[PDB]
Write a protein that binds this DNA or RNA. Structure first.
Ligand SMILES: Nc1ncnc2c1ncn2[C@H]1C[C@H](O)[C@@H](COP(=O)(O)OP(=O)(O)OP(=O)(O)O)O1
Ligand SMILES: [Ca+2]
Ligand SMILES: [Mn+2]
Length: 430
DNA sequence: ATTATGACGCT
DNA sequence: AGCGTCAT
């Protein structure tokens, strides 16, 4: 009852860029705007691999992970932009720099947590309190929420989408009690007003469109963001959760899309997030562990406590390359050349990071894959990173892996290497 | 031959 | 620490 926490203490948003790498390329090349188009890396094998897809191209069935040659079968007029290649490898600098553009704008409104190259969480609780005082019990006009969906509305007593959006928004606003400055529903609504402003700023100042979710925690904000993309934002209220979750496949919730989620389904014999409410906390802890069990117990009621962490910058800087099939590295000269290529990109990025962000990395992680292993990584070893020098880092990396070589001959490398990875970690202020 | 990342959990 | 899981 009255002591039952409802997880309505915070206002959290998740802002996620629409088809991000495609928009970056469309800004640069106007010929790609408002077209079926995709971003591809490499070229020789099956036309390259698609990693981002415009919404026009999605209508033809083009998806991420698809080979471009196959995408062209679905969409003959598909336009393609290629990821830059430097030092023999794909280089994602353009997209990292475009990410910084957006993150810095978001940071003007609130402290953000960078969750990926194209999305960040926002804790808007304090900003909402501030705006609520400015409003002075003034109702929120629908005009302040021009791209907002209210999940679950309209209900009860019609065929256009924009019309449906406004119907839902009007039902929501009509029910709002703006007299209570601690009403969670009102707080979410003001949160949505701020996120409209945030999204307008991003589009004005970068040219990039995005979607957003507004709710009381990160998992619901993330889920919300996806409901109406692209170029729209969605408010998921605490009250909307029972209906929303009653038909929501468990795999849709962030962190449940893999083995744990499959285990929840298998062990409990359920399909939807809402079905979790019928288990005790102890029951869930018994199957999935203390931490997961408590997290699931709360999550299926719309409650989550994970904080928005004040972190705008990545914690690591890494540079990775696969060497598939026949291209696997089978000579020491090969291995050394590619370690140097990776190290040179790493040095470049590290030097820029040090200048921009007043920090220095102190640990170098080296990872490889050997031909045969189905795991992402076969071996991961750390050594000290004491100088931002590519030849030193590549020599050090070679030192830490050189005994993985099964070959009795040391000119040759066996089993051939199908992946190399260098990562700088453990930053200190400088 | 679904690549290049990047965070956090376990023991 | 080195590995695994999940994610974008
Ligand atoms: N598996 C991947 N491999 C390489 N790059 C990826 C992968 N997934 C995502 N990216 C990159 C390209 C994306 O444009 C960018 C953001 O990813 P994501 O938010 O999942 O999709 P998206 O922004 O392209 O479309 P959406 O509008 O559906 O969000 O990160
Ligand atoms: Ca996105
Ligand atoms: Mn994203």
């Amino acid at each position: 009852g009255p002591h039952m926490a409802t997880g309505q203490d915070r206002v959290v948003a998740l802002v996620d860029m629409d088809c991000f790498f495609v928009q970056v390329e469309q800004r640069q090349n106007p010929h790609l705007r408002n077209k079926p188009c995709a971003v591809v890396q490499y070229k020789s094998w099956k036309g390259g691999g698609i990693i981002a897809v415009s919404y026009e191209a999605r209508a033809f069935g083009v998806t991420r992970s698809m080979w471009a040659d196959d995408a062209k079968k679905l969409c003959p007029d598909l336009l393609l932009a290629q990821v830059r290649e430097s030092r023999g490898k794909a280089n994602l600098t353009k997209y990292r720099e475009a990410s910084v553009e957006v993150m810095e704008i978001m940071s003007r409104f609130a402290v953000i947590e960078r969750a990926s190259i194209d999305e960040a969480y926002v804790d808007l609780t304090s900003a909402v309190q501030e705006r609520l005082q400015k409003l002075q019990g003034q109702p929120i006009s629908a005009d302040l929420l021009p791209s907002t969906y209210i999940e679950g509305l309209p209900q009860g007593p019609t065929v256009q989408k924009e019309g449906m959006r406004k119907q839902g928004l009007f039902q929501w606003l009509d029910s709002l009690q703006i007299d209570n400055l601690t009403s969670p529903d009102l707080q979410l609504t003001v949160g949505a007003v701020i996120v409209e402003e945030m999204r307008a700023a991003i589009e004005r100042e970068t040219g990039f469109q995005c979607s957003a979710g507004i709710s009381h925690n990160k998992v619901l904000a993330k889920l919300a963001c996806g409901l109406n993309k692209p170029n729209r934002q969605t408010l998921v209220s605490h009250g909307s959760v029972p209906q929303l979750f009653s038909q929501m496949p468990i795999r849709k919730i962030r962190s449940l899309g893999g083995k744990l989620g499959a285990s929840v389904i298998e062990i409990l014999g359920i399909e939807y997030m809402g079905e979790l409410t019928q288990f005790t906390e102890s029951q869930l802890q018994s199957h999935f562990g203390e931490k997961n069990g408590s997290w699931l117990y709360a999550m299926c009621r719309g409650i989550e406590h994970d904080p928005v962490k004040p972190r705008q910058l990545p914690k690591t800087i890494g540079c990775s390359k696969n060497f598939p099939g026949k291209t696997a590295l089978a000579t020491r000269e090969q291995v050394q050349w590619w370690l140097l290529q990776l190290a040179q990109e790493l040095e470049e990025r590290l030097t820029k990071d040090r200048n921009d962000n007043d920090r220095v990395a102190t640990q170098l992680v080296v990872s490889i894959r050997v031909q045969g292993d189905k795991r992402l990584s076969s071996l991961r070893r750390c050594c000290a990173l004491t100088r931002y020098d590519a030849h030193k880092m590549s020599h050090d990396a070679f030192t830490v892996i050189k005994n993985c070589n099964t070959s009795g001959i040391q000119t040759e490398w066996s089993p051939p290497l199908t992946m190399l990875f260098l990562c700088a970690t453990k930053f200190s202020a400088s």
